[PDB]
């Protein structure tokens, strides 16, 4: 496996993203965990 520092880098840099365009209020709400997103509030109660 990929052990950091040994056969892998210690900290891989996160991919950088340009800044722009406050998306919508109805965009992140319809994929949130509590408000809206009926397929994701059904994804909060555990996996096991």
């Amino acid at each position: 496996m990929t052990i950091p520092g040994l056969n892998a880098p210690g900290l891989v840099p996160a991919t950088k993203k340009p800044a722009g365009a406050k998306p919508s209020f109805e965009s992140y709400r319809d994929t949130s965990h509590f408000w809206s997103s009926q397929g994701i509030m059904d994804s909060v109660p555990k996996v096991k």
């Binding site: 990929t2 950091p4 891989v12 840099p13 996160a14 950088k16 800044a19 722009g20 406050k22 992140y28």
Partner: protein
């Protein structure tokens, strides 16, 4: 009368706050009077726990926005669900829950009055505050940093979701424009 030295149109007639200076940073700030219905030691323990958790959370939020381990190729806002599906959050919950069960026994013994001041686990391996003159000063610094980190983490998550950018957590017109402009502004940015 003894007015509260943080509101001072209201007294310290919230006498559930206790004597002045019993806790560090006691400026008599209890407008809603939560101390009337709850013990002061339990509220203090909750406050200090929130302070330390929010400090670690703010640092981790910024660091995950900057760097990550190999194999954790996830952004900060999606690391939660992705590592839940991966399984690391279960390990975090298990070990933190073990430490917090021990903390629960500690709070049970403290509220019954064994010996404990709230938030004190004796965890000072580096011996920063082994001098008793510097104990009372580092407590206030810990508090103020924790409160500021609470507000900082709230702002971090809310602006990260609201805008959708990395560590500055600012809109496009606040970084790719001019905020200290003095010319006649338009009607949008």
């Amino acid at each position: 009368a003894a007015a509260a030295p943080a509101t001072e149109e209201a007294e310290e007639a919230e006498e559930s706050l206790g004597p002045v200076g019993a806790l560090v940073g006691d400026v008599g700030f209890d407008p809603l009077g939560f101390t009337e219905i709850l013990p002061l030691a339990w509220l203090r323990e909750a406050e200090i726990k929130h302070c330390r958790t929010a400090m670690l959370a703010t640092f981790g939020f910024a660091f995950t926005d900057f760097w990550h381990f190999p194999g954790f190729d996830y952004t900060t806002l999606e690391a939660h669900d992705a590592v839940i599906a991966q399984g690391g959050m279960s390990q975090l919950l298990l070990w933190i829950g073990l430490l917090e069960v021990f903390s629960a026994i500690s709070i049970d013994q403290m509220l019954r009055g064994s010996g404990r001041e709230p938030g004190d686990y004796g965890f000072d391996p580096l011996g920063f505050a082994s001098d008793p003159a510097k104990k009372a000063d580092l407590q206030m610094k810990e508090l103020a940093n924790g409160r500021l980190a609470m507000f900082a983490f709230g702002g971090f998550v809310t602006q990260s979701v609201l805008t959708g950018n990395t560590f500055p957590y600012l809109f496009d017109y606040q970084t790719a424009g001019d905020i200290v402009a003095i010319a006649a502004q338009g009607a949008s940015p």
